[PDB]
């Protein structure tokens, strides 16, 4: 099996340097993800993704492509423990919040990190998420990571990676470790590469949005809201000009003569009514476009912010952009072959009608055995 | 770039969602099946679901499709142990991958990196083969997209990035204009001007009178009375509602989206079906699966991906299956094979 | 100038005592630079000639 010699040594030679514990995300990216959590549209979209992912239900189960008759559910008690932990991770945190934090950090930075506490026999004790901003990792000499540093100076735990850790005689680890699930990008560099996050390509629209809204706020208070710029002449005996002013003024709602005409005997005064449009202060047209851009870059049908579009948002960006990477990352190293983490699609409320109609239509067919009619719509056996 | 990245990761995500497996091929005329061991085939299944550690099959598909879209090339590396049993597969960074040609017509080795590490991985053409034909040592693929004037490998890349330089540059120019004009244009109204005979000192009084009608002022909302010395106000329009040039911007977006082959509507369900079985299926799925099938396994067996794993095609597959069920002048096996379902 | 978004007095009036200054706002249409109408026609032509 494992040959230990991958072709990613192209970068540790000179393009990188070993034993340095380089951080995983540039500080600029951290600040951008930080201030993007206060922006209206960006926060709305981010917690929309988080909520949608957080709603799905977990379980461990037999995998469909079980060619491995030598099933890797090493104990079938480790599998029960993994089920337990997938429903209840570390105390003071539930599985739902784990999913939410994981999906959120995946959307902001394109990374997912964790920590496990398998007791002594592959029985995982609890799982903790890792804060991507202040998580550093250290590389080997060949091509990959060995340890993760978490924090700057006082606490300095170099948690080992899953690659190097005291394994069981079957292959399962014996001590703690970490994951660092990563999203690919161009030019390979599996871990030495640059993050791949939507925040890369929305700096321009978010800055434009903030500029327009600042203009709107400033112009809201600062523009005089008065009408009737009335002006008399430089021959009016200032003292009956006050009388004319009181006459003009005392027609407000709830005045002495309210609603009646103004009569001016001699000395023509001249009124002009100010428009004070003030109906485009936020620049509605070049603002909804920035909103549409920073929404679509997150992969959210505009209509969300009809039911066909909800189905689309579910099985176009949530399913193959947060669900498959997370479940494949967990399945890759949390359990042996033949078993892996799965989530029930029929727990999604938007897909229920479609699943039912598909099931009925397949029921109508005959040139298909029952087991495949099942497996084409979930329902393993 | 906003639009280009959106489209690129859209393609990557869509391709990354499809499920692999090795299986009997339909056009199995080769009764001498090339699944040389049927244990190599199990190992290839294993690897197709779990490639090299610290990377899953889904991420392999994503990176492969992405690099195929950007450069029109796909490269890989295999580590078959000693008997055609592949150990792991690694993708190759196209930017810094160099290749060397033979004397007749084709590649022999791939150089990966500039100076320190210098592994000349052999091509699949020349490598220590098994007595059946399978290789024994490592090798690489370099799947290539064809173009005009042949030159199978000596040719120029064929990528959408060739024909979108103009629209992306125009888009960036318009957005830079918009940003610059957003901050820089005074956002004030009421350019009010008095005369050069006003005793500068009651001009300040007139200014305070005009000013103290803002929301939350002493006399807020009431009239302005000016006794003598007519002051003259003009209200500035400050349109500022076309700074990004909406019309000659959506066109550039449409162009750099359609050149990637994405129905505009995506950025209804009929259009999703179209995007699936018009540009994703015959532009990323067939080339990748034919490249893998060409040299990863013998004849009679090849890599296939289940179309019914695509969520957009399920209703169509079900309706087609029912309609075919209604026919009679067709045996059962062909009713199956016309809709997947091998045997 | 100091009424731009993020200035000292941002959004308030301009008061000029004497010496009337004269502002004119430029249109800067710039919304037909590509000539949308006599461009989609060329696109339609070189698409239909390919039979699409």
Author numbering:
A (entry chain U): 16 to 320, 334 to 409
B (entry chain V): 54 to 320, 334 to 409
C (entry chain W): 264 to 315
Provide the authors' original text about this structure:
Caudovirales, the taxonomic order for the tailed double-stranded DNA bacteriophages, is characterized by the presence of a tail—a host cell attachment organelle that is connected to the genome-containing spherical or elongated capsid via a neck. We describe cryo-EM structures of the neck, the neck-capsid and neck-tail junctions, and capsid of the Agrobacterium phage Milano. The tail to capsid junction involves a symmetry mismatch that is bridged by the neck, and is therefore crucial for the assembly of tailed phage. The extensive network of disulfide bonds within and between neck, collar, capsid and tail provides an exceptional structural stability to Milano.
The 15-fold, 12-fold and 3-fold symmetrized maps of the neck were used to build atomic models of the collar, portal, and neck devoid of capsid (portal + neck 1 + neck 2 + tail terminator + collar), respectively. Namely, the dodecameric portal ring (12 × gp7), which is embedded into the capsid shell, connects sequentially to the dodecameric neck 1 ring (12 × gp14), hexameric neck 2 ring (6 × gp15) and hexameric tail terminator ring (6 × gp18). The structures of portal, neck 2, and tail terminator rings of Milano show considerable similarity to their counterparts in other bacteriophages at both protomer and oligomeric levels. The β-sandwich domains form a positively charged “bowl”, which houses a negatively charged portal clip domain region thus strengthening the connection between the portal and the neck tube. The lumen of portal, neck 1, and neck 2 possesses a positive electrostatic potential resulting in a positive charge of the neck lumen —suitable to hold and position the end of the negatively charged linear dsDNA until the genome release.
